Amino acid sequence: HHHSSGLVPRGSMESGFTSKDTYLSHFNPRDYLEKYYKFRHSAESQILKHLLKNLFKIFCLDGVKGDLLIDIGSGPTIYQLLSACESFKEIVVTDYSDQNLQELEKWLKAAPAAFDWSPVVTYVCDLEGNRVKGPEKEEKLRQAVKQVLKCDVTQSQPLGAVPLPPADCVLSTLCLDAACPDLPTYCRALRNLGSLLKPGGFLVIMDALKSSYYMIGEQKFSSLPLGREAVEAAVKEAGYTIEWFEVISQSYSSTMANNEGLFSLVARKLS
Numbered sequence: 277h278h279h280s281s282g283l284v285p286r287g288s289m290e291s292g293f294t295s296k297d298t299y300l301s302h303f304n305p306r307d308y309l310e311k312y313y314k315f316r317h318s319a320e321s322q323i324l325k326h327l328l329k330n331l332f333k334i335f336c337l338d339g340v341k342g343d344l345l346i347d348i349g350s351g352p353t354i355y356q357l358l359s360a361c362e363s364f365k366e367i368v369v370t371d372y373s374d375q376n377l378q379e380l381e382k383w384l385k386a387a388p389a390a391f392d393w394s395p396v397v398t399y400v401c402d403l404e405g406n407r408v409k410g411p412e413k414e415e416k417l418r419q420a421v422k423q424v425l426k427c428d429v430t431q432s433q434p435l436g437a438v439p440l441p442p443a444d445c446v447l448s449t450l451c452l453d454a455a456c457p458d459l460p461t462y463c464r465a466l467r468n469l470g471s472l473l474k475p476g477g478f479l480v481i482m483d484a485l486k487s488s489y490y491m492i493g494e495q496k497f498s499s500l501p502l503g504r505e506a507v508e509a510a511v512k513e514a515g516y517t518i519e520w521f522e523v524i525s526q527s528y529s530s531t532m533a534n535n536e537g538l539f540s541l542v543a544r545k546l547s
C-alpha cells in the first residue's frame with residue numbers, strides 16, 4: 277500500500293505494474309461500466325461498436341462455433357458474449373476480481389440493481405438482422421452462461437481446480453493488456469490458456485495497442501503497451517497460428533486511456 281496520487285498506476289509504485297491484488301480493492305465495476313459502456317458517438321462507443329462488429333463477424337459470419345467457449349477476464353461486462361451465444365451451447369465467464377464476478381451474477385439473475393445492457397443488446401440484435409429483439413437475446417445469453425469462475429492468467433492452471441471439458445474457443449477482450457505486466461508473462465498466459473483448449477481450438481483476443489495505462493475516472497491502472505509485432509510474436513511463441521489479425525486506429529479518449537488503436541486476432545492452437 278503506497279498511494280501515488282496518479283503519478284503512477286495504482287498498485288505499481290514498487291514493481292512498475294499494477295499488482296493483481298489492486299483489482300480486488302480499487303477496481304470498482306460500477307464506475308467502470310458507467311464510464312465505458314453507457315452507450316452518443318463518443319470515442320468509447322465507437323470502440324465498443326467495432327468490438328461488437330468483429331465479434332459478430334467472428335462468431336456469426338465465420339465458422340467459430342462449438343460446444344464450449346471460455347471467456348477469460350470477462351470483467352463485469354457481457355457485450356463480448358452477445359454474438360457468441362448464437363454459436364456456442366455453453367459459455368463460462370471468468371475474472372480475477374470478485375467484485376466483477378458479483379456484478380456478472382447480478383446481471384445473470386436479472387437483479388434490478390444490475391447494469392442495464394439493453395442498448396448494447398439492441399445494437400447486436402440490429403447487427404444480426406433483427407431476428408429477435410433485446411429481451412429474447414438477453415435471455416438466450418443468460419441461459420448460455422453456465423458458470424462464473426475465478427481466473428488468474430498468471431497460474432499454470434488459470435481456472436484452478438475447477439474441471440471443464442476442453443473448450444472449442446477461448447475469448448479474451450481487454451483483459452491480457454491489464455493482467456500481464458511483461459511480455460514473458462503475456463506469452464505464458466497465452467500458453468496457460470491453451471491448456472483449456474481442444475487441439476485446433478480457437479483463440480480470440482481483442483485489446484488495446486501501445487497503451488501504458490487506462491483510467492476509471494481518476495483511478496489509473498497499468499496496461500502493457502504492446503505493438504502489433506509483439507502481440508503476434510507472443511501468440512506464435514505460445515503455440516498458436518494466426519488466422520487473421522486486424523489493427524484499427526481508433527483510440528479511447530485521452531482522458532481514459534493512452535492507447536494507439538486496438539487489435540483483434542483469431543488464432544488456432546497448433547500441434
Ligand SMILES: CC(=O)N(CC#Cc1cccc(C(N)=O)c1)C[C@H]1C[C@@H](n2ccc3c(Cl)ncnc32)[C@H](O)[C@@H]1O
Nearest residue numbers: 349351372373428429450451453455484487490499533
Ligand atoms: C476485461 C476488462 O474489462 N478489464 C477492465 C478494463 C479495461 C480497459 C479499458 C480500456 C482500455 C484499456 C487499456 N488501455 O488497456 C483497458 C480488465 C480485467 C483484467 C482482470 N485481471 C487483472 C488481473 C488478472 C489476472 Cl492475473 N488474471 C485474469 N484477469 C485479471 C481484472 O479483473 C479486469 O476484470
